[PDB]
Amino acid sequence: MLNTTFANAKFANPFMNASGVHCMTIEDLEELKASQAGAYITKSSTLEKREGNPLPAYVDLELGSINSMGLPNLGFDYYLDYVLKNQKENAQEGPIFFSIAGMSAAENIAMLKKIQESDFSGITELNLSCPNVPGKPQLAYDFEATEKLLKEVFTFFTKPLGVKLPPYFDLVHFDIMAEILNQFPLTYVNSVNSIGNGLFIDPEAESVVIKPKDGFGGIGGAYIKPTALANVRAFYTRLKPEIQIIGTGGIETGQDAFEHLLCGATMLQIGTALHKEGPAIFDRIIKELEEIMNQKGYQSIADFHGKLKSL
Amino acid sequence: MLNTTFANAKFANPFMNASGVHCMTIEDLEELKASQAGAYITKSSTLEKREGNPLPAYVDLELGSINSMGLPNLGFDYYLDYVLKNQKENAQEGPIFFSIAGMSAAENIAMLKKIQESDFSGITELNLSCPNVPGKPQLAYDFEATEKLLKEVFTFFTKPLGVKLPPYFDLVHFDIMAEILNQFPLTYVNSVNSIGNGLFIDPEAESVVIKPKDGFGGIGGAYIKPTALANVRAFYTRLKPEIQIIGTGGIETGQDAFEHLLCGATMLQIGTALHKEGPAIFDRIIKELEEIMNQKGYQSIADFHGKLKSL
Ligand SMILES: Cc1cc2nc3c(=O)[nH]c(=O)nc-3n(C[C@H](O)[C@H](O)[C@H](O)COP(=O)(O)O)c2cc1C
Ligand SMILES: Cc1cc2nc3c(=O)[nH]c(=O)nc-3n(C[C@H](O)[C@H](O)[C@H](O)COP(=O)(O)O)c2cc1C
Ligand SMILES: O=C(O)c1cc(=O)[nH]c(=O)[nH]1
Ligand SMILES: O=C(O)c1cc(=O)[nH]c(=O)[nH]1
Ligand SMILES: [Mg+2]
Ligand SMILES: [Mg+2]
Structure with missing residues (x-):
């Protein structure tokens, strides 16, 4: 019932972990692989290992x-080696997602260049919103810096790429960002980071x-769902159809998931709730969403995807 | 126990209604005056009466x-006429606050000039953060436009003036705004609007x-307290002492109030909770805060004001 097509790939369901949660080590990642999650993503990495x-x-x-x-993480090389190796194995339905959060433009370009040159066939997520690096603000709140970086990225990066965005609270900001993002062959936008x-x-x-x-x-968590849904919906009505959306923020129940999907999200990521509950959360939330669909007579996410009604 | 000094004026306690809640008509205002609120503020007004x-x-x-x-409101003249006649009665401890939210810079300047020319001896609050007017973004998210407006305002406005600010989520933004605000003889900053x-x-x-x-x-409401407290604290450690702070956002209990005061707020405003409970909330929250102080052995707000401890 939850079969999903995203980034020209097929997934059993739309659920994934949110970057940063339960994805620090190979052991964490293998636990996500064994869970019912439709897909999973690595902890945002930096060129070298970082303490936090x-x-x-x-x-x-x-x-x-x-x-x-x-941004505590085991470094770019560590994660690239894991994804390449779980790619050669053909042991899962759907590609792995790889998150990067360079601490400088040059660092992001360097990691993107490495991914481009490697045999990696999965999906990459460029984190433009970490709010916890002392002295380093959220890049996506600087529209000029963001567009400049993305222009350079697309002069060479041809693989599937999405951007993890911070939440916006002014409609004009959604217009500005949509106009910047619509000029690129971006795969998706992931709203929102914390x-x-x-x-x-x-x-x-x-x-x-x-x-x-x-x-x-x-x-x-629950504090941010109104903001998360608003961001997903605002981009859904502004982005060109070629750019899909991953909804993240306040997802704990099947109802929360249903709401993000109504807004236009295609994949869904769980952070806080997964941190508290562990990988068993995927089986629970999948069953909760399916029950909501059964009650409504829906047999596919397409029956309600993006159909949120205005008054 | 809660006696407070703000804007060189004395108030029985720090509690007030948040602009927009229970302050639309003279009848609403008289009800706030009769309540245990330490002070009250009018609904943000525009030059012309608005349906909303x-x-x-x-x-x-x-x-x-x-x-x-x-911004539904009865118009600037309605509120000015009211405060001007009330002021003369000398029937309350502490000035009334007058909120303005002009549709344009020209409208704000015009209202501020009328207030300056009038005999109004109370406090004025310039709302630079209404997030609900179609096609009119929050002015305070445009730093250049904000500084430009305030510079013109202070070429003539000599009466007490505070600004109602939207929430910020990036430390550099607090730095920029603080730098802008500190150059003016502002009376206070009110964080945060919805x-x-x-x-x-x-x-x-x-x-x-x-x-x-x-x-x-x-x-x-509860959704925004973490953001509200952060904004109050971030400005408390950045603003020159001449600019005091009014804390607004997620205040429902004495504990919520205590937290805002610990951050550095001097006056406190209640929106959502007052909307739901009515003016009786002031008597309830005052007792809750006094009970907290009694348990801790505090006899004045000065015993803990701005004393939030870091780890
Ligand atoms: C402990 C923790 C670590 C996180 N690390 C990352 C990270 O490395 N990269 C990233 O893009 N987001 C990170 N996030 C943000 C999440 O991916 C997610 O966007 C956020 O927690 C909002 O979702 P939630 O409401 O389900 O928690 C982190 C969040 C938490 C709580
Ligand atoms: C129905 C409603 C009307 C409001 N009107 C105004 C207004 O005219 N001017 C203003 O500065 N803020 C207005 N606000 C925002 C509040 O003053 C307050 O900043 C906000 O609700 C956050 O506080 P709370 O968490 O206690 O609700 C309004 C809020 C609500 C719910
Ligand atoms: O590792 C972190 O501090 C971090 C990064 C990020 O992008 N988001 C978050 O909430 N935390
Ligand atoms: O009247 C409104 O819509 C309004 C104004 C404002 O400043 N804040 C808010 O939450 N609502
Ligand atoms: Mg699995
Ligand atoms: Mg009274």
């Missing part, structure tokens, strides 16, 4: 999560709950 | 609210829940 910010850096909240991980620089306080201790950046961190 | 966006425009949500009112252009969906009807702008509206 001081702990505590992640905290579970009643309405979601707050985090300032700081709501940047939020704060959570322990009132009894009168202090913040994470160590990095004086307690400021990316917000995920 | 088509209904339904406001919906109560489990985690907050979504709205696209569209999280703009969010979306809420009724999964059973497969439809949005508000009529304007295809269902996109400002988000308030």
Whole structure:
């Protein structure tokens, strides 16, 4: 019922992990492969291995999560070797996704060049929105810098590429970004990364709950679903059909998934909920979405994809 | 216990209504005056009376609210005439706040000039963040336009003035805005207005829940507290001490209030919670905050104001 076509590839269902969650090591990735997830993506990588910010850096909240991980990752070479090797094996339905988050334009270009030259046949996700790198703002909030980077990327990168975007809150910003992105042979847009620089306080201790950046961190979970759905929908009505969408943000139940799909998302990523529940979440949410479809008499996602009604 | 000094004026407590909530008519305002609120503010006004966006425009949500009112208001002259006659009665402890949200820079300048020329002795709040007027983005997301407007404003406005700001999610943005604001003799900054252009969906009807702008509206309530607290704290550590802060966003309990004060807010505004509960909320939240202070052995807000601890 959930069979999905995305990036000219076929997936059993639209569910995936969100980059950064349960995808740090080969062991984590193999657990996602064994789960019911339709597809999975690697932790955003940098050219070299990176330690990350001081702990505590992640905290579970009643309405979601707050985090300032700081891009801890095992490095580009580590992830490229895993994907190449799981590619040669033909042991899964649908390609693996590879996320990169260079700490400079040159770094992103270097990793993209390596992917282009390698035998990698999967999908790449360029992260333009990490809100937890001290001194390095979200690139996608700088429209000029974003367009400049993408123009250089497309002068040589021919493989499937998507961009992970931060949430926008002004309609003109959606217009500007859509006009920048529509000029490229981009495969997809993934909205949204965490709501940047939020704060959570322990009132009894009168202090913040994470160590990095004086307690400021990316917000995920139920707190952000309204923003996530809005971003998915706003881009769905502005992007050229050639650019599909991956919806991310506040997905915990089949109903949350149904809502993202109504908005126009094709693939769906789970962050916070997966962090709390583990890979078993995929079997649960798949069953919940199928039940919603059964009650409505839908046998395919096409029966409601992007059909959100206005009043 | 809650006695507060703000804008060189004395207030019984820091609580106020948030502009837009329970402050449309003289009757609403008189009800706020009779309540236990330390101060109150008028609905943002425009030069001409406005009907507002088509209904339904406001919906109560489990985690907050979504709205696209569209600045319905009785017009600048209506509110000015009211505050001018009330001021003369000397019937309350502390000035009334007057909010303005002109459709254009020219409209804001015209209203500010009328306030300057009038005998108004209260406090004015310039709203640079309404996210619900079709085709009119939040001015405060355009740093150049914001600085330009404020420079003209201060060539003539000498009365107390604060600015209502939209939420920011990137530290560099707080730096830019702080640099801009610190060059002016502003009285305060009010963070934050609703999280703009969010979306809420009724999964059973497969439809949005508000009529304007295809269902996109400002988000308030529990959903936005992490963002609201972060904005209050980020400006508290960046603004010159002459510019105080009013904290707005997700305040429903004494604990929420305590958190805003710990961040650096001096006055506190309640929107969504007041919309749902009515003016009786002030008596409830005041007692909740005093109980928190009593348990901690605090006898004044100064005992913890801005004392949020980092790890
Ligand atoms: C602990 C943690 C680490 C994350 N790491 C990444 C990352 O490396 N790359 C990326 O694009 N997003 C990262 N994200 C953001 C997610 O991919 C996702 O966009 C976000 O958590 C919003 O989804 P949610 O509401 O399901 O949590 C991370 C989120 C969390 C909580
Ligand atoms: C129905 C409604 C009308 C509002 N009208 C205004 C307005 O005229 N001017 C303004 O500055 N803010 C307005 N706001 C925003 C609030 O003042 C407040 O910033 C927002 O709701 C965040 O606070 P909350 O979490 O307590 O709701 C409005 C909010 C709502 C829900
Ligand atoms: O690793 C991180 O800090 C991180 C990166 C990113 O893109 N998003 C997030 O929430 N955290
Ligand atoms: O009247 C409105 O639509 C409105 C104005 C504003 O500044 N904020 C908000 O949430 N609504
Ligand atoms: Mg599997
Ligand atoms: Mg009173």
